[PDB]
Coordinates of C-alpha atoms and ligand atoms in Angstrom, one line a residue:
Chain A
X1 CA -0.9 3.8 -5.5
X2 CA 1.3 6.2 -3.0
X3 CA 4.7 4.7 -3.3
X4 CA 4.8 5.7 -7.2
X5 CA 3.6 8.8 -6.1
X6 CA 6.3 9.2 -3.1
X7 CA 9.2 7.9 -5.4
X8 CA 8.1 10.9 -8.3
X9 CA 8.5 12.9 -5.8
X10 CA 11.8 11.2 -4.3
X11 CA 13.4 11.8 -7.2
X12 CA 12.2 15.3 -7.4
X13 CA 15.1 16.2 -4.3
X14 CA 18.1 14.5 -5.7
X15 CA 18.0 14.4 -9.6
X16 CA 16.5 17.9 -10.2
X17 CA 19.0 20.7 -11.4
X18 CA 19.0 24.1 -13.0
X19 CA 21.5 26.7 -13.9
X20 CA 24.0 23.3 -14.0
X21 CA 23.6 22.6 -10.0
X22 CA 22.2 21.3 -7.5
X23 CA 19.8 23.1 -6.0
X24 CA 17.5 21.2 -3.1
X25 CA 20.5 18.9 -2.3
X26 CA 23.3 21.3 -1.0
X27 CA 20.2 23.2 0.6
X28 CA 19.6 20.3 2.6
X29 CA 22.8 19.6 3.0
X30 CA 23.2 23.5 4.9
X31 CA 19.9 23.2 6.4
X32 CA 20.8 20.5 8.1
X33 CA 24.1 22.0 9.3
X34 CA 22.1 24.8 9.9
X35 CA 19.8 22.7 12.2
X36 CA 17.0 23.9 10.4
X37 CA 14.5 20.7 9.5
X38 CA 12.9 22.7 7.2
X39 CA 13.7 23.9 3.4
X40 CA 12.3 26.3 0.9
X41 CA 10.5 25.0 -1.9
X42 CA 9.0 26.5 -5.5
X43 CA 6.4 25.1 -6.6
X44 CA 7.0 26.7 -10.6
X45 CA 10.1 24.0 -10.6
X46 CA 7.8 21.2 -10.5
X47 CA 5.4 21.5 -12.9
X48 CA 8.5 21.1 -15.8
X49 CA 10.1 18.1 -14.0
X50 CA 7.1 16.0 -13.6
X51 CA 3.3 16.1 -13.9
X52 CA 2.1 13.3 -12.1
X53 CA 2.3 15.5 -9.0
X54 CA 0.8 18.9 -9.6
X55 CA -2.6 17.9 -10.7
X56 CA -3.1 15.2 -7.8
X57 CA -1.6 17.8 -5.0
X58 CA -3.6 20.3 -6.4
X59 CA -7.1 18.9 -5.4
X60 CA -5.9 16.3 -2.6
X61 CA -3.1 18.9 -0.5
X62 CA -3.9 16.8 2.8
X63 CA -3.4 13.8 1.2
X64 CA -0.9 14.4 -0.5
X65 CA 1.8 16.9 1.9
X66 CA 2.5 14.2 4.6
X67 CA 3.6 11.6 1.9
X68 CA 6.1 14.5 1.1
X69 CA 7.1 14.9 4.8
X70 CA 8.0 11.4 5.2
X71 CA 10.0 11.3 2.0
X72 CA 11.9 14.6 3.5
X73 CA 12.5 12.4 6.7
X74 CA 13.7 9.5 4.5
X75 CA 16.4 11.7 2.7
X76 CA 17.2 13.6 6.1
X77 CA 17.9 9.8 7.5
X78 CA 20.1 8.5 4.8
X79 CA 22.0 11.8 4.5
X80 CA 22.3 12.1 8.3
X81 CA 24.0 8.5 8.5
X82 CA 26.1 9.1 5.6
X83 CA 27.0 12.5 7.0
X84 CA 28.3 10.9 10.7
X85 CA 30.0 8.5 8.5
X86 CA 31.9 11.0 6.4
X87 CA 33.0 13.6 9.7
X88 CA 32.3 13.5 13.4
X89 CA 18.5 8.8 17.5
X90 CA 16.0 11.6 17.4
X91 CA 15.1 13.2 13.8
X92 CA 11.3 14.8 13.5
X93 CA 9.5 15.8 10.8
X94 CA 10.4 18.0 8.8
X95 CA 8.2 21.1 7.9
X96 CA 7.7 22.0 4.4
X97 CA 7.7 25.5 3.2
X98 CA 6.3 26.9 -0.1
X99 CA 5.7 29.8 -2.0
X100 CA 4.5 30.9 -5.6
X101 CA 3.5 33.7 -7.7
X102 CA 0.9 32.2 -10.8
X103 CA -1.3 34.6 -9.9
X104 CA -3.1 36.7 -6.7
X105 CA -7.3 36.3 -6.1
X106 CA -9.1 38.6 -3.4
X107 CA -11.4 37.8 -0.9
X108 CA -14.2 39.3 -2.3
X109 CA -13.8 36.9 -5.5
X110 CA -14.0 33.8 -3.4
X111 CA -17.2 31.6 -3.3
X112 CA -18.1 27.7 -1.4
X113 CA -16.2 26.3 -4.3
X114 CA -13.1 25.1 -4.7
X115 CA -12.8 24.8 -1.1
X116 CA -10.1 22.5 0.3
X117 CA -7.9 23.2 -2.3
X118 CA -5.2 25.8 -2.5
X119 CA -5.5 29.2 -3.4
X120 CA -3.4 32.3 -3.4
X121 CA -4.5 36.1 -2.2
X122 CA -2.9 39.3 -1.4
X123 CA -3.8 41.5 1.8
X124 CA -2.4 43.6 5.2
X125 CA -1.7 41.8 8.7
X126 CA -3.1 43.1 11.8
X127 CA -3.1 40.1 14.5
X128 CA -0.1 38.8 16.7
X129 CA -2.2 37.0 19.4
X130 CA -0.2 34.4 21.8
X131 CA 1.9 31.8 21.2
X132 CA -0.5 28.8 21.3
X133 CA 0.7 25.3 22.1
X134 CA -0.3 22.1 20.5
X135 CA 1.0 18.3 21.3
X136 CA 3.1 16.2 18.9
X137 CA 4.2 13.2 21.4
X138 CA 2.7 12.7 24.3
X139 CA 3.0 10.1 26.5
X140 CA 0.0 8.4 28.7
X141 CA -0.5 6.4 31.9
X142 CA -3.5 4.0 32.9
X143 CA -4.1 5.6 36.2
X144 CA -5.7 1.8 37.6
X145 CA -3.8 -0.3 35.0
X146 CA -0.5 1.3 35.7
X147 CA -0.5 0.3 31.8
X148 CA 1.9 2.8 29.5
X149 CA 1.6 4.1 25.7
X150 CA 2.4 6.7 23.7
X151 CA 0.5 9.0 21.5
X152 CA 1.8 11.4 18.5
X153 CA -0.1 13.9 16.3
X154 CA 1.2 15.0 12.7
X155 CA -0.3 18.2 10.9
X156 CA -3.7 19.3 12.7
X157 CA -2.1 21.1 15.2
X158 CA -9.4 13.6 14.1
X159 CA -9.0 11.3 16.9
X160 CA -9.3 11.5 20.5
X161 CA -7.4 9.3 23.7
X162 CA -8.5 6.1 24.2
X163 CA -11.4 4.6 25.5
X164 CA -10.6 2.0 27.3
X165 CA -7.5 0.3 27.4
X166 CA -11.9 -3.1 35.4
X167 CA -11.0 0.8 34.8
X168 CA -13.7 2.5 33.9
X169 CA -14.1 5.4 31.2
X170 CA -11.5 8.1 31.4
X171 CA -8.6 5.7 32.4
X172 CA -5.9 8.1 31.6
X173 CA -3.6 10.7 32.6
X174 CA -1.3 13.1 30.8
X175 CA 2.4 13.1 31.4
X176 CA 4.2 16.4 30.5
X177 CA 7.3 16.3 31.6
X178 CA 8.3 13.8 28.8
X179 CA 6.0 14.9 26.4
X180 CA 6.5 16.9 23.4
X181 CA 4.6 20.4 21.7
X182 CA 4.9 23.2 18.9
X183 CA 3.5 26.6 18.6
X184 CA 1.4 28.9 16.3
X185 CA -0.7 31.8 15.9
X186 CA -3.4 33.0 14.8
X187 CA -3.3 35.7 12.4
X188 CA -5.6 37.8 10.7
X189 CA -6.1 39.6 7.2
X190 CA -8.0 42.2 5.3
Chain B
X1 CA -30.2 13.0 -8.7
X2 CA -26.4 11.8 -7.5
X3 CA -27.9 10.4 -4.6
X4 CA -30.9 8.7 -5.5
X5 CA -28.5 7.2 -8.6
X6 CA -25.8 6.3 -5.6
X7 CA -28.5 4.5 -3.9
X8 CA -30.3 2.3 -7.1
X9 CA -26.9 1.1 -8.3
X10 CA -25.8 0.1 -4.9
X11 CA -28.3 -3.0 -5.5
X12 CA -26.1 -4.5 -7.3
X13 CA -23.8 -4.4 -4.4
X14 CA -32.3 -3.0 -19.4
X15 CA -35.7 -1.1 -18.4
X16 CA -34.7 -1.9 -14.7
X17 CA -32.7 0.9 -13.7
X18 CA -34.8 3.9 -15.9
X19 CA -37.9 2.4 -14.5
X20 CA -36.5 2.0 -10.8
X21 CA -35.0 5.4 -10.6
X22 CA -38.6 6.6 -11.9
X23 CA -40.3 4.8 -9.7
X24 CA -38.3 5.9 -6.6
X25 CA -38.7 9.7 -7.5
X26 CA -41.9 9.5 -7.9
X27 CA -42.8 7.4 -4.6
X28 CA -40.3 9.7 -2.6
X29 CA -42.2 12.4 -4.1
X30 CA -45.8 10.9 -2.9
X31 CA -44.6 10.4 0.2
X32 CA -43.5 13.7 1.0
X33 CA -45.9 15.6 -0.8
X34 CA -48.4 15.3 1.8
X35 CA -47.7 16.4 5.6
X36 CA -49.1 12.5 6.5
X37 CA -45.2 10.7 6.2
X38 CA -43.0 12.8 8.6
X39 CA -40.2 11.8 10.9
X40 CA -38.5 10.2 8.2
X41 CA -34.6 10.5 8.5
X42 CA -33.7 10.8 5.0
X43 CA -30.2 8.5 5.6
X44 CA -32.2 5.5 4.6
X45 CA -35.0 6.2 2.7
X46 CA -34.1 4.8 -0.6
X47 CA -34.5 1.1 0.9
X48 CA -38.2 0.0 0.9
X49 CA -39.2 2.4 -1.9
X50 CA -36.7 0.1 -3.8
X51 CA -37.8 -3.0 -2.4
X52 CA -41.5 -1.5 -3.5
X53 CA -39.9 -0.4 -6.9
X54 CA -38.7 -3.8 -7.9
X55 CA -42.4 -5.5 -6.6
X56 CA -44.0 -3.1 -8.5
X57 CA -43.1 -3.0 -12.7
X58 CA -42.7 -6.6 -13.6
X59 CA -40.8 -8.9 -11.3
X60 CA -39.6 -9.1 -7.6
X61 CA -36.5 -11.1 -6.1
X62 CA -37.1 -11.3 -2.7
X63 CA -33.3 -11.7 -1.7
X64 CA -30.9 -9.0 -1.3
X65 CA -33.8 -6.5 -1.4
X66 CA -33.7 -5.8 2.5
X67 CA -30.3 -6.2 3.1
X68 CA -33.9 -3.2 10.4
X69 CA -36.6 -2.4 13.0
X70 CA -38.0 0.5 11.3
X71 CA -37.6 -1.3 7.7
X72 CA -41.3 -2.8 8.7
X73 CA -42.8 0.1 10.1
X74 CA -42.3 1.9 7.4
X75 CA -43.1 -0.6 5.0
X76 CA -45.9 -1.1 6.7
X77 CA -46.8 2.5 7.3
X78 CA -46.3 3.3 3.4
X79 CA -48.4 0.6 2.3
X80 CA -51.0 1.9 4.3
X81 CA -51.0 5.6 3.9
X82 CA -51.1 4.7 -0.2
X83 CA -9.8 -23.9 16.7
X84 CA -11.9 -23.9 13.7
X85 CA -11.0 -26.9 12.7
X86 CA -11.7 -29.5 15.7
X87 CA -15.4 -28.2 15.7
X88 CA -17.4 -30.8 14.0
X89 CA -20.4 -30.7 11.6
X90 CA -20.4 -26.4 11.1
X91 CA -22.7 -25.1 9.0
X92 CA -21.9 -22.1 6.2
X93 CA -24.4 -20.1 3.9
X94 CA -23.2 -18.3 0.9
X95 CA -22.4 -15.0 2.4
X96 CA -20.3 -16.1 5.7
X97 CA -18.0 -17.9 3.1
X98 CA -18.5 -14.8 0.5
X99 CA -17.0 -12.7 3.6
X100 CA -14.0 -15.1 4.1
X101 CA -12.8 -14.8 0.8
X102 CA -13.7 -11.1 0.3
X103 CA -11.4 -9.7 3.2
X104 CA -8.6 -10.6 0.6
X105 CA -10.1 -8.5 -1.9
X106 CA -10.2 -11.7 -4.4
X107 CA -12.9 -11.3 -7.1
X108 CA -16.0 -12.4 -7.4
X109 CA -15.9 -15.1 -9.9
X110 CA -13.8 -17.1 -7.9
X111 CA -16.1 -16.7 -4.6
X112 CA -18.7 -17.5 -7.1
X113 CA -16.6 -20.9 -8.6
X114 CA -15.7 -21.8 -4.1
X115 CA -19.4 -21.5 -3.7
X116 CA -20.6 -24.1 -6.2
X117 CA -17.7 -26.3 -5.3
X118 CA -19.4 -26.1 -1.4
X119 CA -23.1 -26.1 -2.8
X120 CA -22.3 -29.6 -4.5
X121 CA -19.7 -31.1 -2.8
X122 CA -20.7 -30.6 0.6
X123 CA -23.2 -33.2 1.4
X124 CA -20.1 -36.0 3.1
X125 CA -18.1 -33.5 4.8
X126 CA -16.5 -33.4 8.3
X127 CA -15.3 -30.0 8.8
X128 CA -15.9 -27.4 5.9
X129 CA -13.6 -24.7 7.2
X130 CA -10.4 -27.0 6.0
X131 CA -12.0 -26.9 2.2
X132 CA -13.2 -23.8 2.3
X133 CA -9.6 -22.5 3.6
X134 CA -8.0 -24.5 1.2
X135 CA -9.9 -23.3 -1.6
X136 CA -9.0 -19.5 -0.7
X137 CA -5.4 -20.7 -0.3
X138 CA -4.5 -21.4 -3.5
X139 CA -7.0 -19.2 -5.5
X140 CA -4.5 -16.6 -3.3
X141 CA -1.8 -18.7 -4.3
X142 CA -2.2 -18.4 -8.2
X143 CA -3.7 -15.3 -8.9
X144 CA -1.1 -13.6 -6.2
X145 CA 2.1 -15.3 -7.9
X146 CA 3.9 -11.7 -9.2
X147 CA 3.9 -9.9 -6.1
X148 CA 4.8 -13.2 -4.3
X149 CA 7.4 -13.6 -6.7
X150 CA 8.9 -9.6 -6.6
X151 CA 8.8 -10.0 -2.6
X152 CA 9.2 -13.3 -0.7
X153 CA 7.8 -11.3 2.2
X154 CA 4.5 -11.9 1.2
X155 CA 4.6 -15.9 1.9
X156 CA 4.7 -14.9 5.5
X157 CA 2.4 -12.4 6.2
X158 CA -0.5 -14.4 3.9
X159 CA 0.4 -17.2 6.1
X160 CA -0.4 -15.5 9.3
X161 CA -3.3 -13.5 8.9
X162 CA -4.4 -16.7 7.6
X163 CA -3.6 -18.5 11.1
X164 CA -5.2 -15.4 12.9
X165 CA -8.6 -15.4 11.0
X166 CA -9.1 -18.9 12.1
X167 CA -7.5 -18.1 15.7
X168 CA -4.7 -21.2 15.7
X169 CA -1.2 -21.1 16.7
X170 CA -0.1 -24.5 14.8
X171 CA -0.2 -23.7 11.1
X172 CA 1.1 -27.8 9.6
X173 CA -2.9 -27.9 9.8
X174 CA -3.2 -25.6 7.5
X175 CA -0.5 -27.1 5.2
X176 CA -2.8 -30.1 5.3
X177 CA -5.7 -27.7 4.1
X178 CA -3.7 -26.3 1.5
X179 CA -2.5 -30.0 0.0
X180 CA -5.2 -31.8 0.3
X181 CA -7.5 -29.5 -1.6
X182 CA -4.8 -29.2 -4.1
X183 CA -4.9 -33.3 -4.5
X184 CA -8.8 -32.9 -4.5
X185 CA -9.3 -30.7 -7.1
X186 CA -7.1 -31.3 -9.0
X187 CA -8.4 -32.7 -12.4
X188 CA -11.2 -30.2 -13.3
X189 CA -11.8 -28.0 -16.2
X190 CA -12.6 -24.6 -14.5
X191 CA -9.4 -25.2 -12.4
X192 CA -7.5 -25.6 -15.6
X193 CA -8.7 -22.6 -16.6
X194 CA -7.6 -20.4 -13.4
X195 CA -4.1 -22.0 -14.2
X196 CA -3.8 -21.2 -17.5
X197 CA -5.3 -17.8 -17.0
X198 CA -3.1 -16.8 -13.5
X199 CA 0.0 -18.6 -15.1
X200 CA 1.3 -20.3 -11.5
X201 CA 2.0 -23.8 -12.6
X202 CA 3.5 -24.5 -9.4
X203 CA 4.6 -20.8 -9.6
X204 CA 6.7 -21.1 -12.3
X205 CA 6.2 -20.7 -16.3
X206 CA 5.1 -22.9 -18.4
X207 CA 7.8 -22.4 -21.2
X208 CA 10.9 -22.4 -18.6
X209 CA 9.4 -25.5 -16.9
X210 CA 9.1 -27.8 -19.8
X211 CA 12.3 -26.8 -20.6
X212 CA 13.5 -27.6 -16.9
X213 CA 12.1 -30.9 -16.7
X214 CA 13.0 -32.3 -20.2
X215 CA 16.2 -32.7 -19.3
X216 CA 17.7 -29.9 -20.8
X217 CA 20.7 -27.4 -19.5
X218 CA 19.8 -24.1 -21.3
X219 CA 17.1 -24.0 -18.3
X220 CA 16.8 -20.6 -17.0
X221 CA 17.8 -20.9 -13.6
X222 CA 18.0 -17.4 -12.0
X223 CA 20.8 -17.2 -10.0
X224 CA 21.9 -14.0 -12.2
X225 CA 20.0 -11.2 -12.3
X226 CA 17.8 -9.3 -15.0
X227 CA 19.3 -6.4 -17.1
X228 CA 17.0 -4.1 -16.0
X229 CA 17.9 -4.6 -12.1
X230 CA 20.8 -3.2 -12.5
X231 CA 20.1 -0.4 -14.7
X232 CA 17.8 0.4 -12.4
X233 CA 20.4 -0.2 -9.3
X234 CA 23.1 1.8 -10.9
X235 CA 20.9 5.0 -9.7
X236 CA 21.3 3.9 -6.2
X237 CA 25.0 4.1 -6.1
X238 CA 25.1 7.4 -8.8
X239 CA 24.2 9.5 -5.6
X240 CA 26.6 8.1 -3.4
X241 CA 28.5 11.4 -2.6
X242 CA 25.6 12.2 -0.2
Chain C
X1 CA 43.4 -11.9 -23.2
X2 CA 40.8 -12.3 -24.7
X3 CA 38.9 -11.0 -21.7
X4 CA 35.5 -9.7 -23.7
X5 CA 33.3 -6.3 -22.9
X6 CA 30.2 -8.7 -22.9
X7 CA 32.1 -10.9 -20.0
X8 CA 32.6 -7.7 -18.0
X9 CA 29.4 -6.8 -18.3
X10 CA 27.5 -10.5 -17.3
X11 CA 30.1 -11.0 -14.1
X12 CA 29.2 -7.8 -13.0
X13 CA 25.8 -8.8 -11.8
X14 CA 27.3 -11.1 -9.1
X15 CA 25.6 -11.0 -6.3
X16 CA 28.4 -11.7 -3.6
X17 CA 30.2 -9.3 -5.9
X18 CA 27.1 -6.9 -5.0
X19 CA 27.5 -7.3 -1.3
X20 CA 31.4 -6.7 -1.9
X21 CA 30.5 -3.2 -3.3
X22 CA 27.6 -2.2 -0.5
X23 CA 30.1 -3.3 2.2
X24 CA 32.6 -0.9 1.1
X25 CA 30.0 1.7 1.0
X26 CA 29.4 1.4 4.2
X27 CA 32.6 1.0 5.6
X28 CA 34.2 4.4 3.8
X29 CA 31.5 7.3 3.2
X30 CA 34.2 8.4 0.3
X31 CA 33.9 6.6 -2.5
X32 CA 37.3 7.3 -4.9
X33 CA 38.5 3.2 -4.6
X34 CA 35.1 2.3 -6.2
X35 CA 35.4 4.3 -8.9
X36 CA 38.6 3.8 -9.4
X37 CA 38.0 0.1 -10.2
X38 CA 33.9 -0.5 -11.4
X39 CA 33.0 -0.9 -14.1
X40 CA 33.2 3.4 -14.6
X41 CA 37.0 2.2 -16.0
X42 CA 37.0 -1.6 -16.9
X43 CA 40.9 -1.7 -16.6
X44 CA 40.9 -1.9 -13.0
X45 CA 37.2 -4.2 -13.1
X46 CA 39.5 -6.6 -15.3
X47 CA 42.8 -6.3 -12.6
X48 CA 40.5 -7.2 -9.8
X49 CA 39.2 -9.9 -12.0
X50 CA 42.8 -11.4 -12.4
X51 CA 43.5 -10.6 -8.8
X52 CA 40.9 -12.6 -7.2
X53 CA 41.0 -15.5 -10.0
X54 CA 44.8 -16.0 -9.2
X55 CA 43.1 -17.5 -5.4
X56 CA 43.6 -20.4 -4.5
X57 CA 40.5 -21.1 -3.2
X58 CA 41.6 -21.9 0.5
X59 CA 38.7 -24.1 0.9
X60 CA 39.8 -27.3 -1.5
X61 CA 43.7 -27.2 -0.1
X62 CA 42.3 -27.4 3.6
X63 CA 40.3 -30.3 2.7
X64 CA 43.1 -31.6 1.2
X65 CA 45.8 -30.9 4.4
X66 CA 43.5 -32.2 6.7
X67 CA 43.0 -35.6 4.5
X68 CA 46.9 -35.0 5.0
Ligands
LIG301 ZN1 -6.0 0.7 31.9

């Protein structure tokens, strides 16, 4: 199933510690103070803690990284509420951030296999292109039917608008004053 | 190889399979050796070579062979180049009710066990969307008892995607389906079996029941709660300071 | 007296008790009154146990006033 998968990972946040402290928890805790919605994470803490994660994430990544976003938004919730309660409506996603060091594999080693999995690599930079846009929630009119929805995209910044909600093909137009969008780049490597 | 393997056990969805999967490499093989069988869109063309496989080494079932406008031709072109409930008097086949009680995922055994029950009970009937329903009902009922039982949610939703399949608003019809079957087949010795197997008894256990009805006060009634709920609630609260 | 570890530990699981606990919970984020008195340190458990037996269950005496 996923919900044994997303509670071995749950558990993972709160009831991990080293050096005799808590580690993820008080950096969630600042990051959210911080205003952040994002953390750091290592990967070499979670092979120890529990396997039933590694070897799954390894192959599936896609499949596997938005279970961990929602769990991430399930922790920011509770510990937002609880937060209000203890001093002093719109909470997205947050963004998970990685790194490692197991090991470093060229470009000139790599093949058509293992593809879709994850990898690690070593190089020098050379692009900084343009701050391209992409949409997260967007909201859509029937331009005959008058008729409202609503529209959000996760991590490919699949599916297109719909096709019909007579109106004819093409029966919608794109707000953007109460829409929503991120950015990235693309960046090079040799 | 993974292919042609995919596609000869997907029939079922001894010397039959060796023999089929020779046969189908070595009729795929004639056919495209020679430059006379082109235009052949290789995302179906391990059907008919089948169908041809299975006439060919000893014996041929006819159903479930072709299961379609160029199915023919190239058969043909191989061969030579070598509510629901007020309607009255429905009819059903072994498939449509197959589908009914396949979109809950239930095995086959049971379709199998609904299908004779229709097959030899169906001769004085009125309507057999109430029996069939029925039937599904509680097979959903008494395999389905531990997930019912760890979430009362379930009751519901069964319920009404249940009323939604057969497109009614009032559901005591339904609870008519359900009860009537359950005084109809009552009494019979595959039933008994499901029951003892799937352990519902009414949805409760045999050994608390007799116990409950005997007229005893030891009965485990479960007001309280299980050790292990709150060992495994005390977690909850052990992270409170967050 | 004779108030037993084993008792403790069986009227814990009551479920109104349960929603006793949660509703505190939520009414104060700290959380120093509840472990002053669970089960963490069965002295106070066993004082709120005397506490709340000592009621007089308000329900039985306004049955009997309005009979009255
Ligand atoms: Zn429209």
């Amino acid at each position: 199933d996923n919900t044994e998968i997303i509670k071995s990972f749950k558990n993972f946040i709160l009831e991990f510690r080293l050096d005799s402290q808590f580690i993820y928890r008080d950096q969630l805790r600042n990051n959210i103070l911080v205003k952040n919605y994002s953390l750091t994470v290592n990967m070499e803490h979670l092979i120890g803690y529990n396997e039933d994660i590694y070897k799954k994430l390894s192959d599936e990544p896609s499949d596997i990284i938005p279970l961990f976003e929602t769990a991430i938004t399930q922790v920011a919730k509770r510990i937002s509420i609880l937060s209000r309660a203890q001093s002093a409506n719109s909470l997205p996603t947050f963004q998970l951030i990685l790194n490692s060091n197991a090991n470093q594999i060229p470009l000139r080693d790599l093949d058509s296999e293992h593809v879709s999995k994850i990898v690690r690599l070593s190089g020098i930079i050379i692009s900084t292109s343009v701050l391209s846009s992409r949409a997260t929630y967007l909201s859509i009119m029937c331009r005959n039917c008058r008729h409202t929805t609503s529209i959000t995209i996760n991590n490919f910044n699949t599916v297109s608008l719909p096709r019909s909600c007579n109106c004819g093909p093409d029966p919608y137009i794109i707000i953007h004053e109460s829409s929503k969008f991120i950015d990235q780049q693309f960046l090079k490597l040799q | 190889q993974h292919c042609v393997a995919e596609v000869l056990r997907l029939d079922p969805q001894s010397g039959y399979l060796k023999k089929l999967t020779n046969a189908t490499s070595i009729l795929y093989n004639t056919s495209l050796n020679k430059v006379m069988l082109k235009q052949d869109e290789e995302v179906a063309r391990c059907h008919i070579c089948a169908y041809i496989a299975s006439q060919k080494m000893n014996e041929k079932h006819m159903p479930d062979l072709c299961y379609p406008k160029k199915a023919k031709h190239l058969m043909n072109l191989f061969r030579q180049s070598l509510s629901l409930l007020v309607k009255k008097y429905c009819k059903m086949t072994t498939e449509e009710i197959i589908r009914l009680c396949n979109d809950f995922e239930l095995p086959r055994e049971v379709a199998y066990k609904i299908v004779d029950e229709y097959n030899i009970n169906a001769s004085r009937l009125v309507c057999p969307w109430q029996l069939v329903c029925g039937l599904v009902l509680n097979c959903t009922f008494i395999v389905f008892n531990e997930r019912r039982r760890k979430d009362p949610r379930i009751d519901h939703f069964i319920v009404s995607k249940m009323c939604s399949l057969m497109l009614t608003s009032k559901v005591d019809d339904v609870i008519e389906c359900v009860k009537l079957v359950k005084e109809l087949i009552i009494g019979e010795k595959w039933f008994r079996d499901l029951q003892i197997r799937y352990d519902d008894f009414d949805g409760i256990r045999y050994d608390e029941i007799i116990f409950r009805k005997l007229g005893s006060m030891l009965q485990t009634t479960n007001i309280l709660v299980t050790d292990d709920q709150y060992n495994i609630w005390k977690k909850r609260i052990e992270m409170d300071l967050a | 007296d004779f108030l037993n570890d084993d008792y403790l530990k069986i009227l814990s699981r009551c479920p109104t008790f349960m929603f006793f606990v949660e509703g505190l919970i939520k009414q104060h984020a700290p959380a120093d009154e509840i472990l002053s008195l669970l089960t963490n340190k069965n002295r106070g458990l066993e004082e709120f146990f005397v506490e709340f037996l000592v009621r007089e269950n308000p329900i039985n005496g306004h049955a009997k006033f309005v009979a009255r």
